[PDB]
């Protein structure tokens, strides 16, 4: 009967990197999705499966708010049926996706002048991620036929690389903060409701 922490997720001071993306389980609350749909902050709001208006009339078992940071060119890749470095190696969405994808520019927050090396993305991986999979492996990638045994060098690459966000880059290559809402419904008790 109390309010939902969506404010915790969106207005967070720090956001995780893409490969190590954070997930929040929202439950035992009642939430106003109107704040989200009627806001001018977002640059992208793509719901896949549900009308975000009309949402406050439903109830769900669990609503998951995933969150991370990618470059603006990658925001289109956060979607069912999509392919790219981000969709295959860092964060994948299922084809029968029931949810919404929100993104807004943050060049003023997440871009250091010399390069923000705290944001990473997985560039090497021998198999695409299954939907909703999360890989935090730091093991050196064996590109060659020769084993590396914990030492990087030629054909032995660290599997994560830095976006290196800087503010003078074009709008395309700037950090966008992304939230992904996921709605699930088992034949279990619904606890995430709306007003009235």
């Amino acid at each position, epitope marked *: 009967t109390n309010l939902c922490p969506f404010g915790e997720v969106f207005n967070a001071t720090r956001f995780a990197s893409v490969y190590a993306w954070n997930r929040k389980r929202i439950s035992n609350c009642v939430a106003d999705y109107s704040v989200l749909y009627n806001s001018a902050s977002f640059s992208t709001f793509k719901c896949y499966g549900v009308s975000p208006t009309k949402l406050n009339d439903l109830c769900f078992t669990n609503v998951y708010a995933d969150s991370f940071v990618i470059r603006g*060119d990658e925001v289109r890749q956060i979607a069912p049926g999509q392919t790219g470095k981000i969709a295959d190696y860092n964060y994948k969405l299922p084809d029968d996706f029931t949810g919404c994808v929100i993104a807004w520019n943050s060049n003023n927050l997440d871009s250091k002048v010399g390069g923000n090396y705290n944001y990473l993305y997985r*560039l090497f991986r021998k*198999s695409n991620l299954k939907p909703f999979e999360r890989d935090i492996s730091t093991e050196i990638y*064996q590109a*060659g*036929s020769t084993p590396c045994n914990g030492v990087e060098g030629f054909n032995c690459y660290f599997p994560l690389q830095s976006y290196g966000f800087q503010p003078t880059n074009g709008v395309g290559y700037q950090p966008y903060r992304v939230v992904v809402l996921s709605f699930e419904l088992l034949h279990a008790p619904a606890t995430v409701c709306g007003p009235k």
Partner: antibody
Amino acid sequence: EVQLVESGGGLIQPGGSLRLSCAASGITVVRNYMTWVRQAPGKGLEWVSVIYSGGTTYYADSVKGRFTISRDNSKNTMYLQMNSLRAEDTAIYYCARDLEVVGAMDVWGQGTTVTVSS
Amino acid sequence: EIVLTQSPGTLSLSPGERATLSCRASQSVPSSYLAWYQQKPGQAPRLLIYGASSRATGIPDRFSGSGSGTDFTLTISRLEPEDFAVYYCQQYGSPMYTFGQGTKLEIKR
């Protein structure tokens, strides 16, 4: 050493179909970003396609729908099937591996020539 | 689609002089995602600079890269015989890679 060896090309009529080969030594193509890069006679270099380690592929506009890229680890090789071949496809064709921001196209193949002419 | 343009088309200095090869993009491209290749006649491209300024492994200390935004430079501080060839620039910011037109370097005699 570390080498990319190309076979495939030669002389083929328009409307034809070739299959080019990128055989691999001390680099596993199942594990890397692999791209193909052609140079039409006397002109400069043009990007053609890329296969991601997980099998996601990209193709240049002038070739979408006609070129197709494929790999065999057992022979450690990358094939590219070309169809409906036109004059302008006549080029020398390189395959190579890029490392993106870790380095780009560090290993390059010798080149396989393709002429499209009746 | 990003469109790299080089200047000058042709250029001829003598051995030991300085060569300043240019490359400007139709869109600002970050310095991290740009490469310089060298191709001698009949051969195949040789990677020279990965990143705007990083020597690929084996490249002598005389090749250097510089620049940012939409203007980039490749510089040979001293020219030696084996450094006369055609040099290309490539962008890899999108997965749709694109090359420059190329600068032919010849010997002045």
